[PDB]
């Protein structure tokens, strides 16, 4: 009928960072991690080691990067 | 010589053109001068020394 106290407890935290703030930001951090990989793919497209491993296997875009110069026009 | 390949001539054609000239080589085991035919990495030679 009547209330004379307030029941409470302390949530897990360390400094200014709490456990409840990390769960709110977790889905957004994975998108930033995804968006950071995409930015890396833009700046390493001219790297042949990455081309032979990742970019040449992309359909409709991979075969574009292939070089088809016949051996009789290459000095080296 | 290597810069003419794929521009105005074939690799197999430029090699024949270069082999008709003579270039200084490394000295032999006794230290005497030597000559050798040209390669693709050589430069086009001139008429006067
Ligand atoms: C990086 C150090 C964490 C600092 C921190 O934990 O800062 C506290 C913020 C909470 O900030 P806020 O949501 O209350 O808004 C702030 C308005 N000025 O935690 C987060 O951003 C959670 C994501 C941190 C990344 C892990
Ligand atoms: C760092 C040095 C790595 C150089 C290399 O590993 O590769 C070097 C290749 C050689 O390209 P290229 O000279 O054959 O043709 C291309 C003629 N322009 O350039 C590249 O990839 C471009 C550099 C991509 C990396 C940028 C930073 C990514 C992070």
Swiss-Prot record, chain A:
It is found in: Mitochondrion inner membrane. Component of the ubiquinol-cytochrome c oxidoreductase, a multisubunit transmembrane complex that is part of the mitochondrial electron transport chain which drives oxidative phosphorylation. Residues 45-76 are mitochondrial intermembrane. It is a single-pass membrane protein. Component of the ubiquinol-cytochrome c oxidoreductase (cytochrome b-c1 complex, complex III, CIII), a multisubunit enzyme composed of 10 subunits. The complex is composed of 3 respiratory subunits cytochrome b (COB), cytochrome c1 (CYT1) and Rieske protein (RIP1), 2 core protein subunits COR1 and QCR2, and 5 low-molecular weight protein subunits QCR6, QCR7, QCR8, QCR9 and QCR10. Its main location: mitochondrion. InterPro entries: Cytochrome_b-c1_su10_fun. One of its GO terms (biological process) is cellular respiration. This is Cytochrome b-c1 complex subunit 10, mitochondrial. Residues 1-20 are mitochondrial matrix. Belongs to the UQCR11/QCR10 family. Present with 5590 molecules/cell in log phase SD medium. Keywords: Electron transport, Membrane, Mitochondrion, Mitochondrion inner membrane, Respiratory chain, Transmembrane, Transmembrane helix, Transport. The chain crosses the membrane at residues 21-44. One of its GO terms (cellular component) is mitochondrion.
UniProtKB/Swiss-Prot annotation, chain B:
Belongs to the cytochrome c family. The gene is CYT1. Component of the ubiquinol-cytochrome c oxidoreductase (cytochrome b-c1 complex, complex III, CIII), a multisubunit enzyme composed of 10 subunits. The complex is composed of 3 respiratory subunits cytochrome b (COB), cytochrome c1 (CYT1) and Rieske protein (RIP1), 2 core protein subunits COR1 and QCR2, and 5 low-molecular weight protein subunits QCR6, QCR7, QCR8, QCR9 and QCR10. Present with 39900 molecules/cell in log phase SD medium. Residues 20-29 have a biased composition (Acidic residues). The chain holds residues 112 to 160 of 309 of the full protein. This is Cytochrome c1, heme protein, mitochondrial. It comes from Saccharomyces cerevisiae (strain ATCC 204508 / S288c). It is found in: Mitochondrion inner membrane. Component of the ubiquinol-cytochrome c oxidoreductase, a multisubunit transmembrane complex that is part of the mitochondrial electron transport chain which drives oxidative phosphorylation. Residues 20-49 are annotated as: Disordered.
């Amino acid at each position: 009928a009547y209330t004379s106290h307030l029941s409470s407890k302390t949530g897990l935290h360390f400094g200014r960072l709490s456990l409840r703030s990390l769960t709110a930001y977790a889905p957004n951090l994975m998108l930033w991690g995804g968006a950071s990989m995409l930015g890396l793919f833009v700046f390493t497209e001219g790297w042949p080691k990455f081309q032979d491993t990742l970019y040449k296997k992309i359909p409709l875009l991979g075969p574009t990067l292939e070089d088809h110069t016949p051996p009789e026009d290459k000095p080296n | 010589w290597r810069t003419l390949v794929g521009v105005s001539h074939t690799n197999e054609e430029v090699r024949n053109m270069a082999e008709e000239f003579e270039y200084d080589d490394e000295p032999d085991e006794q230290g005497n001068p030597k000559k050798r035919p040209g390669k693709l990495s050589d430069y086009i030679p001139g008429p006067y020394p």
